[PDB]
Amino acid sequence: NNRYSFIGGRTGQWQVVKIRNVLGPGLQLVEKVNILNGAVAEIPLDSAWRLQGFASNIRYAIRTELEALQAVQPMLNRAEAILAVLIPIKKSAQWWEMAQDERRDIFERESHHTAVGLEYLPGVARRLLHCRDLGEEFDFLTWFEFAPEHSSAFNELLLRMRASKEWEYVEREVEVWLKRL
Amino acid sequence: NNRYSFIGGRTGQWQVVKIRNVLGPGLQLVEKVNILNGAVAEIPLDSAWRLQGFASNIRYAIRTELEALQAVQPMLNRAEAILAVLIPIKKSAQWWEMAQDERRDIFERESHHTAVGLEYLPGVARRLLHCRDLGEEFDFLTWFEFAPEHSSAFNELLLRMRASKEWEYVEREVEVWLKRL
Ligand code: HEM
Ligand code: HEM
Ligand SMILES: [Cl-]
Ligand SMILES: [Cl-]
């Protein structure tokens, strides 16, 4: 199954440490996030919100970037990676109507997304889910996990991404910080 | 709603003229195709199959290409566009694991998909839907409609595309030919 669901409420494998409502309407604070590998139609009881998305193909990265990533990126579920952060993102209509060279140019040529992210590996593990195509309120679910040593660096990465040209198209962002139970 | 459904069976706005099972397991012949702008979970009565897909953002076209397309491409549902073809396509795992530069290059640099397709406009109208990300048996549903004067041309276009480098990655294909009721 390529589909993943995230349920904020009273049960799950993860404890909510905090939520930061960076841009746009926020998400309700909950005790726990429950993560599931499947679609969930039936909104669980005592649950405040459901996010979902799917794992998909590469949209921007070129072969050499892929090779560079594969050489250093960590797997998910390292025993040390007890902190995680879920970050939903929505981009503007003006971004989606742009052609594929335009978007590519803003993503790497101008914003150096891949080159910047590479500096935070192997400390940081990541997964990217897509959800615009499902009718969701957000366009993406981003997932990051790392050992506590790396929390500082991760915060530094967030402030850099948000200073890029790419982030000018971002109209909605929440940080859900988590601790593995 | 970005989601479109196509049910083969005994009702619909389109009459099946023929089905050609070009490559891989085919689709059951039926009398009609019903086309709905939403999901359909409830497998309709006396229906052989259901295909679905969503409209999405541009994946390969650059700005200059988009501009050429917009100069000439016809709208859907022109009075004279009484013939239609629905063509589901699946591409190989080996296609999907390639990077974004690699697929772009096979699609345009080697195959000239857009340049070739542009020679058949404005006779031919088209819609493109994606469905690998939904877990369908096909990766894409393609939709073409035109007046009968353009049938022979459309047939020439199919044979050109299928000789392309792109089409070496196609592992499943069906043409469903239709007539508007
Ligand atoms: C930690 C190191 C990071 C690396 C190595 C990295 C790498 C990448 C790469 C290579 C892609 C492109 C995937 C593709 O071609 O389909 C991507 C996409 C994305 N990344 Fe990152 N990333 C990192 C961190 C982050 C962070 C912190 C955020 C947001 C807070 C983020 C948000 C995104 C988004 C939203 C996309 C999808 C872009 C789109 O389709 O418009 N990434 N990331
Ligand atoms: C009639 C003129 C045609 C034009 C102008 C045309 C144009 C295009 C364009 C510009 C794209 C890229 C969309 C994007 O960047 O997201 C595309 C994708 C596609 N076209 Fe065509 N097309 C034509 C005919 C056909 C035909 C006859 C077929 C199949 C029999 C076909 C199959 C496809 C498929 C499968 C894709 C998606 C490729 C992918 O995302 O991997 N096209 N078409
Ligand atoms: Cl990823
Ligand atoms: Cl289209």
Residue numbers in the entry:
A (entry chain B), B (entry chain A): 2 to 182
Wording from the paper:
OmpK36 GD, referred to as simply ‘OmpK36’, is a 373 amino acid outer membrane porin from Klebsiella pneumonia involved in nutrient and antibiotic diffusion in gram negative bacteria, while Cld is a heme-b-containing homodimeric oxidoreductase from Cyanothece sp. PCC7425, consisting of 181 amino acids per monomer. The effectiveness of AnACor is demonstrated for long-wavelength data sets collected at 3.54 Å, on a crystal of the membrane protein OmpK36 GD, and at 4.13 Å, on a crystal of the heme-binding enzyme chlorite dismutase (Cld). The choice of these two samples for this study was motivated by their crystallization in low-symmetry space groups, posing a challenge for the conventional absorption correction methods used in standard X-ray diffraction scaling programs.
In addition to three methionines and one cysteine per polypeptide chain, each Cld monomer also binds an Fe-containing heme ligand and a Cl− anion. A single SO4 2− anion could be identified for the dimer, bringing the total number of anomalous scatterers to 13. For Cld, the merging R factors, I/σ(I) and anomalous slopes are noticeably better for AC compared with SH. In contrast to OmpK36, where data quality indicators changed little between the SH and AC strategies, for Cld, the analytical absorption correction strategy (AC) gives substantially better data statistics compared with SH. For instance, in terms of the merging R factors, we observe a decrease of the R merge from 0.163 with SH to 0.112 with AC and a further decrease to 0.095 with the ACSH treatment. The anomalous slope value increases from 1.36 with SH to 2.48 and 2.5 for AC and ACSH, respectively. This indicates an impressive improvement in the anomalous signal as a result of applying analytical absorption corrections. For the largest peaks, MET99 and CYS132, we observe increases in peak heights from 14 to 17 and 18σ for AC and ACSH, respectively. However, while the difference between AC and ACSH is small, they outperform the spherical harmonics correction. This is in particular reflected in the outcome from experimental phasing, where two data sets are sufficient for both AC and ACSH, while three data sets are needed to solve the structure from data corrected by SH.
